[PDB]
Each structure stands twice: as structure tokens, then as C-alpha cells.
Design a protein around this ligand. Structure first.
Ligand SMILES: *[C@@H]1O[C@H](CO)[C@@H](O)[C@H](O)[C@H]1NC(C)=O
Ligand SMILES: *[C@@H]1O[C@H](CO)[C@@H](O)[C@H](O)[C@H]1NC(C)=O
Lengths: 50, 50
């Protein structure tokens, strides 16, 4: 568990090594569009993700 | 291993306060650097022992 009660430290089901599991990676899709009448091309931004 | 052979004197049981003993792990979960409040069976602090 963690502060948000989320999994952060994991006992290896087998040997005695220490495992770390994070949930699925994601992001926030934000689009940068001009006017529909003016143009049709869309550039997309990814929120806080390298 | 049977009925007593008398000679059983009665010592006076002196009482001492258990300061901070009797605390254990209530769950088999792993939390890192938190402050968790729980409701469970415990020794009261500074309670007299026999
Ligand atoms: C394109 O459509 C927009 C939306 O109202 C408006 O600027 C106008 O109707 C059009 N612009 C032109 C034809 O320059
Ligand atoms: C332990 O606690 C009380 C006061 O806290 C003490 O006077 C006494 O010796 C003990 N209690 C009992 C019931 O023996």
C-alpha cells in the first residue's frame, strides 16, 4: 500500500527479491485545433508525459 | 502431574505498569512512511501487569 492505498512495494511470489509494481501508464490527450472552417489539421499534446 | 503435595505458599503479586509493550502488526500488508490509525485489541498504556 501507500499514501493513496496504492501498490508500491511487492514481495516476489517466488524468490526473496523485492519487486515494484506501478499501474498502467496513461496521459491526457489534449488537441490544438484551429477553426473547422479555416483548416482541418490537428496537433495533439501529451499531458506531462515524456 | 497430579494432586498437590501442599507446601504452596501465596506470594503477594506486585504490580508494575507496562509502559509501551504489547503492540504488534495487525495485518500482513506493507506500507511505507505513513501514519495509520487502527481499531484492534491492544494493551492499554501504563496498565498494571500481574
Ligand atoms: C467560416 O465559419 C466560421 C464559423 O461561423 C465563420 O468565421 C464564417 O462563417 C466563415 N468564415 C469565412 C467564410 O471566412
Ligand atoms: C494498577 O493500577 C492502579 C492505579 O493505576 C494501582 O493502584 C493498582 O496497584 C493496580 N490495579 C489493580 C486493580 O491492582
Amino acid at each position: 500500500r501507500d499514501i493513496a492505498d496504492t501498490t508500491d512495494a511487492v514481495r516476489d511470489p517466488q524468490t526473496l527479491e523485492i519487486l515494484d509494481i506501478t499501474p498502467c501508464s496513461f496521459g491526457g490527450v489534449s488537441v490544438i485545433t484551429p477553426g473547422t472552417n479555416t483548416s482541418n489539421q490537428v496537433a495533439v499534446l501529451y499531458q506531462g508525459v515524456n | 502431574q497430579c494432586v498437590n503435595l501442599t507446601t504452596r505458599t501465596q506470594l503477594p503479586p506486585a504490580y508494575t505498569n507496562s509502559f509501551t509493550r504489547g503492540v504488534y502488526y495487525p495485518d500482513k500488508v506493507f506500507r511505507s512512511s505513513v501514519l495509520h490509525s487502527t481499531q484492534d485489541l491492544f494493551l492499554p498504556f501504563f496498565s498494571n501487569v500481574t
